[PDB]
Amino acid sequence: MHARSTGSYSLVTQQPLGGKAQFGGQRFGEMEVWALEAYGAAYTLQEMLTVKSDDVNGRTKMYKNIVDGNHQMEPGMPESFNVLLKEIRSLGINIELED
Amino acid sequence: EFDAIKIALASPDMIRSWSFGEVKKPETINYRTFKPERDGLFCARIFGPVKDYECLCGKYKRLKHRGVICEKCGVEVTQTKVRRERMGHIELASPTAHIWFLKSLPSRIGLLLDMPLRDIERVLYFESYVVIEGGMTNLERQQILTEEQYLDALEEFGDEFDAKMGAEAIQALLKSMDLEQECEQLREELNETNSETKRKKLTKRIKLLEAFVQSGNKPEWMILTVLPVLPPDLRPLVPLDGGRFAASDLNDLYRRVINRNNRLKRLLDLAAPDIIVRNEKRMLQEAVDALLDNGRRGRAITGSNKRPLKSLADMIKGKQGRFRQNLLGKRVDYSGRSVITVGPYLRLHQCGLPKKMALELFKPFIYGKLELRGLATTIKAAKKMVEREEAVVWDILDEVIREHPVLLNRAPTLHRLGIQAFEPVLIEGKAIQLHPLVCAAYNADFDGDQMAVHVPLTLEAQLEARALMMSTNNILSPANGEPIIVPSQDVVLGLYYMTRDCVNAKGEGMVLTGPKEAERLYRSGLASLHARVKVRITEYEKDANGELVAKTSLKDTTVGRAILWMIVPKGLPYSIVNQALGKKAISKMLNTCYRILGLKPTVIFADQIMYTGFAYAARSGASVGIDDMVIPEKKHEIISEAEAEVAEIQEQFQSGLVTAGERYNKVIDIWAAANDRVSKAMMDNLQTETVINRDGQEEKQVSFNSIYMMADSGARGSAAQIRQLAGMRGLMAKPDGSIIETPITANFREGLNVLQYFISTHGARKGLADTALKTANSGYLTRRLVDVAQDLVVTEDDCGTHEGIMMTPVIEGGDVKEPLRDRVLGRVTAEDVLKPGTADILVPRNTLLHEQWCDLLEENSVDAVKVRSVVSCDTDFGVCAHCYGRDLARGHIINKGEAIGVIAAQSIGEPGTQLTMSSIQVKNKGSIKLSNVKSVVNSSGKLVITSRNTELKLIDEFGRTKESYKVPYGAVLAKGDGEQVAGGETVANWDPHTMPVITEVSGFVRFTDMIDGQTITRQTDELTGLSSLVVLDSAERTAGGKDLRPALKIVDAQGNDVLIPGTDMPAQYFLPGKAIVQLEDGVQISSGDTLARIPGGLPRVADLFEARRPKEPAILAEISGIVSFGKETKGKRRLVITPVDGSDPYEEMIPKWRQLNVFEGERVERGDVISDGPEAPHDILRLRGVHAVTRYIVNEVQDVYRLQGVKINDKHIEVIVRQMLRKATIVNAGSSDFLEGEQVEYSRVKIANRELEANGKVGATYSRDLLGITKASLATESFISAASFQETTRVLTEAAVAGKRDELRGLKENVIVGRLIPAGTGYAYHQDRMRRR
Amino acid sequence: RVTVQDAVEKIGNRFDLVLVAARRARQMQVGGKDPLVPEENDKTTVIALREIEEGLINNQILDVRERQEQQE
DNA sequence: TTTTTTTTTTTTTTTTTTTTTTT
DNA sequence: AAAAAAAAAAAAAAAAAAAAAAA
Ligand SMILES: [Mg+2]
Ligand SMILES: [Zn+2]
Ligand SMILES: [Zn+2]
């Protein structure tokens, strides 16, 4: 048994640190992502990917809402999209958005 | 807040618009202070403040002048995180080519300018002067020159001629191009071109021009003039443990590039000699290429050591590539784990969660409800309270977990049930309890299995976990409709024991009351549990319209049966539980409760059945004593008889009377016979065999032996294994697979021997290893399927089509297994079901075929109904809701959004590991029916079939097909079509071997063109000691006689040439090569005279899906007409088809060794198998078309999966097929740009025809092409996905040059970018967001 | 609450049910506006589902009330 | 009978210890 | 010469030649 709520995080991946030897939470591998996609359940997947993996601002905001008594994610594109967008823009590629 | 994504080549003004200012100085830090040198590589005013809400000058401090650009240091006052996104740019001294478009492989710049890569690189890298508007000179625009040639050109015409060397030359070339003129001339040439390769290259060029025209991009941006610079944080400066700052790896590229560009500016301003500045430009171009993707053009530069350094392009490549990053795997928070433990006393929607793990999952929720209640207002006090285990925190935790569903996920999550979600109830200790019934979908076994607990935080996620995933809303699994909450191991044994007829026991012969007094009788011990007795159960049947009609009456039963009846809800009839409930009748009872009284009563009834099964299983105490594995007393006698049999057979073989192979086969056969005898004996001793007094004399009843009780109940262990426990355990096959001659003659109760046990280890270990391999095999198969299925999502309520396949019961060569019930259940009818009675519409057109309509079909016994199918639904990028049918996880028609691709893929996945790695005797009463019938009375008098692909069916007296057998050609048929054939007739008859040349009419044999010694030989067959004529093939017969074909122009009794009945031409039967013409000349033949005596596991599923063609495909008739053997002896025989309806344009070569079922001249419809053998799928689509490749793939794979034990409903295979063949080759120009050689996604051509026919234009015809799932996944309709499949740089380059906008469609691009997975809640959210706009 | 079958037909889709119930629950959690049906220690979300099954809450009703107060 | 075009089948290229660099 | 940091632990592209077909 190995629980996990907000333990020590990783170095470069910045995900929750994995491994029983360092208070690690169960790995949410691809096949579980398919398992959620089969269900209509989307917010839970979107939160397994962003607000509980790497989004520091999202993590803090969600913690505030939970302790404050509000159950609510913050709608908005994960910052990983923004990092990728700036990465592409480093190259001479428009990579703009749309509607 | 982000609709479809767009990618395009960036204009220089766009790049400068992506910056606040320009970098102009390569500098990192002071090395004394932290000085960010002005215009430095980490310049404060270009990127941001080094410290939050500060100015480098330090004037303003930390909030007051927020967002102020310090008038002195010129720096905004914002957070340091603003430094993460503020892009910069370096203006290039000269235009510099972008390597990515230079080396896309194939280069896009290449065909853009249509120049060889060699010359374009020469001009690019400064070793050749391209010609630019050669004009009135011997040189021309496309021409290039080396240094000597350029010098000579200058000498001869160095007045107006222009030629430059370098990247700027390529830029100038790009300025000099008018793609509209190019479009016109190249389309004209494509019209003129005939060489398919020439058309292909020209259409590559025309697609380039089409891209640049339709896309807003302009080719001159291929040559960069302003290099963007990433914000400093994304290229972190990572200061080393010293005054120096270790400037990353990309920053080094910036150092080199910036220094080179500054020196180039210096040389330009000083105007140094052209050689030096040319070398400088070459170095700058090399440096920029290395910055883009080092290691592509030249040798990659390194860091401190020889070890190479990365590049910006590496950020979009490899495992650390930020495309495939949210797919590898994320260590999600609020996770958990534990070993598992059974959880009776739980309901069917409760998961016993430990205390020590539920105070470390809902910790923040506890903080919230604790500080809010005021028990400890300050947060740190709340933390120290929970860590203090104070009694109040248990109460608060109970409150928060009152209703806060958790998600329990097993390790391999093949199914979509493998992430079911439960409510929590807190136990002590540490083990995630788990309701027993829901141990099936998970597949856990409570022998060390470990499940992970996630939680949903946001309120939407809570509502999802309670609505879409709760364990009480998934009684029906996705693949197969029937329940997957099915009583499994002990509950069924308890139910079985609780209801069994015992001939005489306590409480026999009495009439108690309703069930209540039955339970009272049992508990007091007065009446034994098994007691055939009459009671007064009253059943509330739904006989009236939705009304519980109650009827009561004295009915025979058992006391235990009456006791169990209390758990059945109202609606069910009593007889639902009056048998001895096995594992079959119990699932049937549960399913009937579902269909009759909906869902929630089924959950209540599953709880009750599990509880009242466990309790009475315990009170039974069914225990496996050793003495209850009874062995037959006849076993030793039977084995002695078998031993004597093998002794006599072996002795006879030693005498030579029987060969070794026959002796071995006879030995194994008699061992099998003895094994059958012993198995029957032991199954008869175990079963029945319980003789007991009935209060009068003795009588026998089904036994209560614990082993047999288990096996009959179906608790765990069918007849085979108990046979292995008591009877002979069979003949174990040797490691190769050949069956061992001497079987194991000792059950498990008696001992094995070292030899026998050592033999059994072979089969045991082979089974283990094969399972271990099939694990990964099924894994790979699921991955491919979900890769090619994830695209879809049910996005259209109704496509309003009419082309639904026609489903019929499937007949396995006279063994119809699936009636029309299943393979049309739920799926929506396309055309209104018409009763076999004429003009009697059974059900309307677009109606759902739920169970009652299926019952109506059964009562009318319709043998074929047209059902809409997702294999062809008129939708752009999804699939109609009606055209899909029921969801087969909830029952009602699939609601808008629920992804079916990743439902399908997994349903056709998970049940993969279970997958293992002369005359027809009529057996039923019916009448003869024939398909493709062309027959006639034969000389033998019965019949002869003159058609090749004839099939014989047995139409029952209901006017419905039951049996079906492929009739071979030249078969003896006693009766004919339309004659009564009761169960027992043997009308079909034929030679199982040989390919007789039957002559349908009489006439004297004539050797017209069959010259002996040149085409035929009068060989003396010594088998019968008679002379027979043998036709000689091209090699056997003379080359001069090769033209002399062995024709048989038969002449009738009158001597006139026998014309074929219905044709003017003579019946010149061209016999095949090496044929044995038994008859002689002048022999009067008769009807059908025979003249010439011519002689499973996963891999199959993968081949069917991967469209892997057979190695020796069956060859079909590509067009209808009369066949004609064309030119011969050219390695492969040439064959021509002459459409009798039209011309004879089609001909092709086929191998000589591949035998033909058809003769030289025969009228053959298209699809006629020119040769038999394995059948390819792609040619079926080529000829039969869609709705036939479906009924091939679905039939074949569903047969492979119906082979072992599983039931994969056809919707899933159908959607995988639809995704397989969504691309079609263009058949005509129509009126759009679509060239014939082009192949485009079927949706694109469909909408093209739609919009062309809406106007006066003409649509372009097409031919849909099948693609293997690996091939289809390689094919793409969304550039982000293709990036997810590696070759990222190529995908990005192609998309950018094409301006290829991408839909955020399908569930894999959105996960990568990170928006809402647009399937369920995501799909409704996105449609709502679009609606508000 | 245990099953949600009764709420499916009230908001036919089973996903728009999720988002509508989430809307109502968010209204009832921090947006005040107490539930119109009594609670049994139930979380706000289960009360939202319960009222949806009761039929007195639907996306149309929520939009009507939001517009009415937005006019204020 | 000779040349050119097209096919296809063959080949070749793509968490720990050690090594290289720096003081 | 010692210590510290970086990285290592079959598929398909191209082309020669053989065979088909047209002049
Ligand atoms: Mg196990
Ligand atoms: Zn300042
Ligand atoms: Zn449809």
PDB file of N, CA and C and ligand atoms in Angstrom, chain B residues 54-60 68-77, ligand 2:
ATOM      1  N   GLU B  54      10.129  43.668 -10.352  1.00  0.00           N
ATOM      2  CA  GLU B  54      11.294  44.501 -10.100  1.00  0.00           C
ATOM      3  C   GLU B  54      11.782  45.113 -11.401  1.00  0.00           C
ATOM      4  N   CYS B  55      12.507  46.221 -11.274  1.00  0.00           N
ATOM      5  CA  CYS B  55      13.269  46.793 -12.372  1.00  0.00           C
ATOM      6  C   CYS B  55      14.751  46.591 -12.095  1.00  0.00           C
ATOM      7  N   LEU B  56      15.512  46.307 -13.153  1.00  0.00           N
ATOM      8  CA  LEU B  56      16.944  46.093 -12.992  1.00  0.00           C
ATOM      9  C   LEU B  56      17.599  47.293 -12.326  1.00  0.00           C
ATOM     10  N   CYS B  57      17.137  48.497 -12.657  1.00  0.00           N
ATOM     11  CA  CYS B  57      17.598  49.684 -11.955  1.00  0.00           C
ATOM     12  C   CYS B  57      17.211  49.662 -10.484  1.00  0.00           C
ATOM     13  N   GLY B  58      16.169  48.922 -10.122  1.00  0.00           N
ATOM     14  CA  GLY B  58      15.728  48.859  -8.748  1.00  0.00           C
ATOM     15  C   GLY B  58      14.875  50.023  -8.305  1.00  0.00           C
ATOM     16  N   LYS B  59      14.435  50.875  -9.234  1.00  0.00           N
ATOM     17  CA  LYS B  59      13.626  52.032  -8.862  1.00  0.00           C
ATOM     18  C   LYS B  59      12.351  51.599  -8.150  1.00  0.00           C
ATOM     19  N   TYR B  60      11.506  50.845  -8.840  1.00  0.00           N
ATOM     20  CA  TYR B  60      10.238  50.393  -8.292  1.00  0.00           C
ATOM     21  C   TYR B  60      10.423  49.047  -7.602  1.00  0.00           C
ATOM     22  N   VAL B  68       4.910  48.498 -15.074  1.00  0.00           N
ATOM     23  CA  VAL B  68       5.525  49.741 -15.522  1.00  0.00           C
ATOM     24  C   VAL B  68       6.841  49.415 -16.206  1.00  0.00           C
ATOM     25  N   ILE B  69       7.067  50.035 -17.358  1.00  0.00           N
ATOM     26  CA  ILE B  69       8.360  49.967 -18.027  1.00  0.00           C
ATOM     27  C   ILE B  69       9.237  51.048 -17.404  1.00  0.00           C
ATOM     28  N   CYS B  70      10.253  50.638 -16.648  1.00  0.00           N
ATOM     29  CA  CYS B  70      11.120  51.602 -15.981  1.00  0.00           C
ATOM     30  C   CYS B  70      11.735  52.542 -17.001  1.00  0.00           C
ATOM     31  N   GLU B  71      11.521  53.844 -16.812  1.00  0.00           N
ATOM     32  CA  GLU B  71      12.000  54.815 -17.790  1.00  0.00           C
ATOM     33  C   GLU B  71      13.513  54.761 -17.943  1.00  0.00           C
ATOM     34  N   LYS B  72      14.220  54.253 -16.933  1.00  0.00           N
ATOM     35  CA  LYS B  72      15.676  54.231 -16.974  1.00  0.00           C
ATOM     36  C   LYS B  72      16.203  52.937 -17.585  1.00  0.00           C
ATOM     37  N   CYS B  73      15.871  51.800 -16.979  1.00  0.00           N
ATOM     38  CA  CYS B  73      16.304  50.509 -17.494  1.00  0.00           C
ATOM     39  C   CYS B  73      15.363  49.942 -18.550  1.00  0.00           C
ATOM     40  N   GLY B  74      14.197  50.548 -18.754  1.00  0.00           N
ATOM     41  CA  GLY B  74      13.311  50.123 -19.830  1.00  0.00           C
ATOM     42  C   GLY B  74      12.752  48.726 -19.674  1.00  0.00           C
ATOM     43  N   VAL B  75      12.314  48.364 -18.470  1.00  0.00           N
ATOM     44  CA  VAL B  75      11.863  47.008 -18.174  1.00  0.00           C
ATOM     45  C   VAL B  75      10.495  47.064 -17.507  1.00  0.00           C
ATOM     46  N   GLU B  76       9.571  46.245 -18.005  1.00  0.00           N
ATOM     47  CA  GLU B  76       8.263  46.082 -17.386  1.00  0.00           C
ATOM     48  C   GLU B  76       8.412  45.643 -15.934  1.00  0.00           C
ATOM     49  N   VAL B  77       7.393  45.943 -15.130  1.00  0.00           N
ATOM     50  CA  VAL B  77       7.298  45.413 -13.774  1.00  0.00           C
ATOM     51  C   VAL B  77       6.219  44.340 -13.741  1.00  0.00           C
TER      52      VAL B  77
HETATM   53 ZN    ZN F   2      13.355  49.883 -13.743  1.00  0.00          ZN
END
